[PDB]
Protein backbone atom coordinates (compact mmCIF):
# COMPACT_ATOMS: atom_id res chain seq x y z
CA UNK A 1 0.00 0.00 0.00
CA UNK A 2 1.11 3.58 -0.71
CA UNK A 3 0.72 6.62 1.52
CA UNK A 4 -1.38 8.18 -1.23
CA UNK A 5 -3.88 5.36 -1.77
CA UNK A 6 -6.17 6.27 1.15
CA UNK A 7 -6.47 9.88 -0.04
CA UNK A 8 -8.48 8.79 -3.11
CA UNK A 9 -10.98 6.33 -1.63
CA UNK A 10 -13.91 8.77 -1.95
CA UNK A 11 -14.92 11.79 -4.08
CA UNK A 12 -12.11 14.39 -4.11
CA UNK A 13 -12.58 18.05 -5.12
CA UNK A 14 -10.31 19.22 -7.94
CA UNK A 15 -8.91 22.64 -8.86
CA UNK A 16 -7.06 23.23 -12.14
CA UNK A 17 -5.25 26.52 -12.84
CA UNK A 18 -3.48 27.12 -16.15
CA UNK A 19 -1.37 30.13 -17.14
CA UNK A 20 -0.93 30.09 -20.91
CA UNK A 21 1.13 31.92 -23.52
CA UNK A 22 0.86 30.75 -27.15
CA UNK A 23 2.75 32.92 -29.67
CA UNK A 24 2.36 35.75 -27.14
CA UNK A 25 -1.42 35.34 -26.79
CA UNK A 26 -1.74 35.32 -22.98
CA UNK A 27 -4.64 33.41 -21.46
CA UNK A 28 -5.72 31.71 -18.25
CA UNK A 29 -8.03 28.75 -17.57
CA UNK A 30 -9.67 27.80 -14.27
CA UNK A 31 -11.21 24.37 -13.73
CA UNK A 32 -13.38 22.96 -10.96
CA UNK A 33 -14.88 19.54 -10.37
CA UNK A 34 -14.38 16.25 -8.63
CA UNK A 35 -12.63 12.92 -9.07
CA UNK A 36 -13.67 9.43 -8.00
CA UNK A 37 -10.61 7.22 -8.57
CA UNK A 38 -12.56 4.17 -7.38
CA UNK A 39 -14.28 4.36 -10.79
CA UNK A 40 -11.46 6.09 -12.68
CA UNK A 41 -13.85 9.00 -13.09
CA UNK A 42 -13.44 12.73 -13.23
CA UNK A 43 -15.82 15.55 -14.08
CA UNK A 44 -14.48 19.06 -14.66
CA UNK A 45 -15.75 22.38 -15.98
CA UNK A 46 -13.08 24.70 -17.37
CA UNK A 47 -13.53 28.45 -17.96
CA UNK A 48 -11.27 30.73 -19.97
CA UNK A 49 -11.09 33.59 -17.49
CA UNK A 50 -9.34 35.98 -19.88
CA UNK A 51 -12.02 35.87 -22.57
CA UNK A 52 -11.91 33.80 -25.75
CA UNK A 53 -9.55 30.81 -25.57
CA UNK A 54 -6.93 31.47 -28.30
CA UNK A 55 -6.44 27.73 -28.99
CA UNK A 56 -9.04 24.96 -29.38
CA UNK A 57 -10.29 23.38 -26.17
CA UNK A 58 -9.47 19.81 -27.36
CA UNK A 59 -5.77 20.69 -27.61
CA UNK A 60 -5.70 21.36 -23.84
CA UNK A 61 -7.43 18.17 -22.61
CA UNK A 62 -4.24 16.23 -21.82
CA UNK A 63 -2.69 19.28 -20.11
CA UNK A 64 -5.72 20.18 -17.97
CA UNK A 65 -4.69 14.52 -13.18
CA UNK A 66 -3.85 10.87 -13.71
CA UNK A 67 -3.95 10.21 -9.97
CA UNK A 68 -7.68 9.69 -10.59
CA UNK A 69 -7.05 6.64 -12.78
CA UNK A 70 -8.51 3.36 -11.57
CA UNK A 71 -5.71 0.86 -10.91
CA UNK A 72 -7.08 -2.68 -10.47
CA UNK A 73 -6.10 -4.46 -7.27
CA UNK A 74 -3.42 -6.54 -9.00
CA UNK A 75 -1.94 -3.32 -10.44
CA UNK A 76 -1.94 -0.96 -7.44
CA UNK A 77 1.83 -1.40 -6.92
CA UNK A 78 2.23 0.33 -10.29
CA UNK A 79 0.30 3.49 -9.32
CA UNK A 80 3.04 6.13 -9.27
CA UNK A 81 0.51 8.97 -9.36
CA UNK A 82 -1.24 8.26 -6.05
CA UNK A 83 1.96 7.12 -4.33
CA UNK A 84 3.47 10.62 -4.67
CA UNK A 85 0.56 12.21 -2.73
CA UNK A 86 -0.08 14.41 -0.85
CA UNK A 87 3.26 16.14 -1.62
CA UNK A 88 2.62 15.41 -5.29
CA UNK A 89 4.44 15.20 -8.58
CA UNK A 90 5.62 17.36 -11.45
CA UNK A 91 4.13 16.55 -14.87
CA UNK A 92 6.03 17.95 -17.86
CA UNK A 93 5.22 17.61 -21.56
CA UNK A 94 6.20 18.82 -24.96
CA UNK A 95 3.27 18.50 -27.37
CA UNK A 96 4.32 18.69 -31.03
CA UNK A 97 1.52 19.68 -33.41
CA UNK A 98 2.48 18.29 -36.81
CA UNK A 99 3.29 21.06 -39.31
CA UNK A 100 2.48 23.63 -36.61
CA UNK A 101 3.76 24.82 -33.23
CA UNK A 102 4.49 23.07 -29.96
CA UNK A 103 3.34 23.39 -26.35
CA UNK A 104 5.75 23.05 -23.45
CA UNK A 105 3.91 22.38 -20.19
CA UNK A 106 5.05 22.15 -16.58
CA UNK A 107 2.48 21.23 -13.93
CA UNK A 108 2.47 20.50 -10.22
CA UNK A 109 -0.19 18.03 -9.06
CA UNK A 110 -0.59 17.97 -5.29
CA UNK A 111 -3.03 18.32 -2.44
CA UNK A 112 -3.72 21.72 -0.95
CA UNK A 113 -5.81 20.84 2.08
CA UNK A 114 -8.56 18.49 0.91
CA UNK A 115 -8.35 19.65 -2.71
CA UNK A 116 -6.34 18.00 -5.47
CA UNK A 117 -4.71 20.86 -7.42
CA UNK A 118 -3.23 20.82 -10.92
CA UNK A 119 -1.25 24.06 -11.39
CA UNK A 120 0.07 24.45 -14.96
CA UNK A 121 2.33 26.76 -16.93
CA UNK A 122 2.03 26.41 -20.72
CA UNK A 123 4.27 28.00 -23.36
CA UNK A 124 3.37 27.69 -27.05
CA UNK A 125 5.85 28.65 -29.78
CA UNK A 126 6.09 28.62 -33.60
CA UNK A 127 2.34 28.37 -34.26
CA UNK A 128 0.79 29.52 -37.52
CA UNK A 129 -1.47 32.48 -36.72
CA UNK A 130 -3.94 31.39 -39.42
CA UNK A 131 -3.32 27.65 -38.99
CA UNK A 132 -5.56 24.89 -37.66
CA UNK A 133 -4.87 25.64 -33.99
CA UNK A 134 -4.81 29.45 -33.74
CA UNK A 135 -7.44 29.49 -36.51
CA UNK A 136 -9.82 27.30 -34.48
CA UNK A 137 -10.27 24.62 -37.16
CA UNK A 138 -10.48 21.58 -34.83
CA UNK A 139 -13.71 19.81 -33.96
CA UNK A 140 -14.96 19.90 -30.37
CA UNK A 141 -14.55 16.19 -29.64
CA UNK A 142 -12.04 13.61 -28.46
CA UNK A 143 -11.04 10.02 -29.12
CA UNK A 144 -10.36 7.16 -26.74
CA UNK A 145 -6.69 6.38 -26.28
CA UNK A 146 -4.34 3.77 -24.85
CA UNK A 147 -1.11 5.14 -23.36
CA UNK A 148 2.01 3.20 -22.44
CA UNK A 149 3.45 4.36 -19.10
CA UNK A 150 7.14 3.47 -18.77
CA UNK A 151 9.36 3.52 -15.72
CA UNK A 152 12.05 6.22 -15.60
CA UNK A 153 14.36 4.79 -12.93
CA UNK A 154 17.01 7.48 -13.47
CA UNK A 155 14.50 10.20 -12.52
CA UNK A 156 12.60 8.07 -9.96
CA UNK A 157 9.49 8.59 -12.06
CA UNK A 158 7.71 7.70 -15.28
CA UNK A 159 7.76 8.74 -18.93
CA UNK A 160 5.44 8.30 -21.90
CA UNK A 161 5.34 8.92 -25.65
CA UNK A 162 1.90 8.85 -27.26
CA UNK A 163 -0.10 10.27 -30.15
CA UNK A 164 -3.29 12.32 -29.93
CA UNK A 165 -5.20 12.72 -33.20
CA UNK A 166 -7.47 15.79 -33.36
CA UNK A 167 -10.22 16.03 -35.99
CA UNK A 168 -9.85 18.99 -38.38
CA UNK A 169 -13.08 20.34 -39.84
CA UNK A 170 -11.91 19.61 -43.40
CA UNK A 171 -12.02 15.91 -42.52
CA UNK A 172 -8.28 15.43 -42.01
CA UNK A 173 -6.36 14.74 -38.79
CA UNK A 174 -4.16 17.08 -36.75
CA UNK A 175 -1.52 14.97 -35.01
CA UNK A 176 -0.32 16.01 -31.53
CA UNK A 177 2.81 14.06 -30.54
CA UNK A 178 3.06 13.95 -26.73
CA UNK A 179 6.28 13.42 -24.77
CA UNK A 180 5.64 13.22 -21.02
CA UNK A 181 7.72 12.90 -17.86
CA UNK A 182 6.62 12.81 -14.22
CA UNK A 183 8.83 13.10 -11.13
CA UNK A 184 8.03 13.34 -7.41
CA UNK A 185 7.85 16.74 -5.79
CA UNK A 186 10.52 17.09 -3.15
CA UNK A 187 12.44 14.27 -1.55
CA UNK A 188 9.50 11.92 -1.53
CA UNK A 189 9.49 8.16 -1.93
CA UNK A 190 7.18 6.77 -4.59
CA UNK A 191 6.19 3.47 -6.15
CA UNK A 192 8.32 2.95 -9.27
CA UNK A 193 6.02 1.07 -11.67
CA UNK A 194 6.79 -1.42 -14.33
CA UNK A 195 5.62 -0.56 -17.83
CA UNK A 196 1.84 -0.68 -18.22
CA UNK A 197 -1.09 0.77 -20.16
CA UNK A 198 -3.72 3.30 -19.22
CA UNK A 199 -6.95 3.30 -21.23
CA UNK A 200 -8.68 6.67 -21.51
CA UNK A 201 -12.01 7.95 -22.77
CA UNK A 202 -13.11 11.57 -22.83
CA UNK A 203 -16.41 13.31 -23.60
CA UNK A 204 -16.50 17.06 -24.25
CA UNK A 205 -19.71 19.00 -23.74
CA UNK A 206 -21.08 22.48 -23.16
CA UNK A 207 -23.18 23.99 -20.40
CA UNK A 208 -26.10 25.51 -22.37
CA UNK A 209 -26.57 28.15 -19.65
CA UNK A 210 -22.90 29.22 -19.66
CA UNK A 211 -22.03 32.32 -21.71
CA UNK A 212 -18.26 32.26 -21.11
CA UNK A 213 -15.84 30.24 -23.24
CA UNK A 214 -15.70 26.91 -21.46
CA UNK A 215 -15.34 23.14 -21.66
CA UNK A 216 -17.18 20.44 -19.70
CA UNK A 217 -15.10 17.24 -19.49
CA UNK A 218 -16.09 13.74 -18.39
CA UNK A 219 -13.08 11.43 -18.42
CA UNK A 220 -12.53 7.79 -17.47
CA UNK A 221 -9.02 6.36 -17.09
CA UNK A 222 -8.29 2.74 -16.17
CA UNK A 223 -4.99 0.91 -15.86
CA UNK A 224 -5.69 -1.79 -18.41
CA UNK A 225 -2.84 -4.13 -17.52
CA UNK A 226 0.80 -4.79 -18.23
CA UNK A 227 -0.34 -5.59 -21.79
CA UNK A 228 -3.03 -4.32 -24.19
Give a written overview of the molecule.
With 228 residues, the chain is mostly beta strands. It has one domain: Beta Barrel (Green Fluorescent Protein). It is 2% helix and 50% strand. The chain is built from one helix and eleven strands. The protein has an eleven-stranded mixed β-barrel. The chain is globular and about 50 Å long.
Summarize the structure.
Helix content is 2%, strand content 50%. The chain has 1 helix and 11 strands; from the N terminus they run βββαββββββββ.
List keywords for this structure.
228 residues, mainly beta, Green Fluorescent Protein, 11-stranded mixed β-barrel, 2% helix, globular
| Count of runs of 4 or more consecutive helical residues | 1
- Sheet-strand content, in percent, reads over 45%
Order of helices and strands: EEEHEEEEEEEE
Largest sheet: 11 strands, mixed, barrel
Radius of gyration: 17 Å
Helicity level, as a percent range? under 10%
Give the helices and strands, then pairings:
Layout: E1 12-22, E2 25-36, E3 41-48, H1 80-83, E4 89-97, E5 102-112, E6 115-125, E7 145-152, E8 157-167, E9 173-184, E10 196-205, E11 214-225
Parallel strand pairs: 1-6
Antiparallel strand pairs: 1-2, 2-3, 3-11, 4-5, 4-9, 5-6, 7-8, 7-10, 8-9, 10-11
PDB class: fluorescent protein
Keywords: Green Fluorescent Protein, fluorescent protein
Assembly: monomeric
Amino acid sequence: VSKGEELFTGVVPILVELDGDVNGHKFSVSGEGEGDATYGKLTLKFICTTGKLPVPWPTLVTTLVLCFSRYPDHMKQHDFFKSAMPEGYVQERTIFFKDDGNYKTRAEVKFEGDTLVNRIELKGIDFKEDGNILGHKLEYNYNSHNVYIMADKQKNGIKSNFKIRHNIEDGSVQLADHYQQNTPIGDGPVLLPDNHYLSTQSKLSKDPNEKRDHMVLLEFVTAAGITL
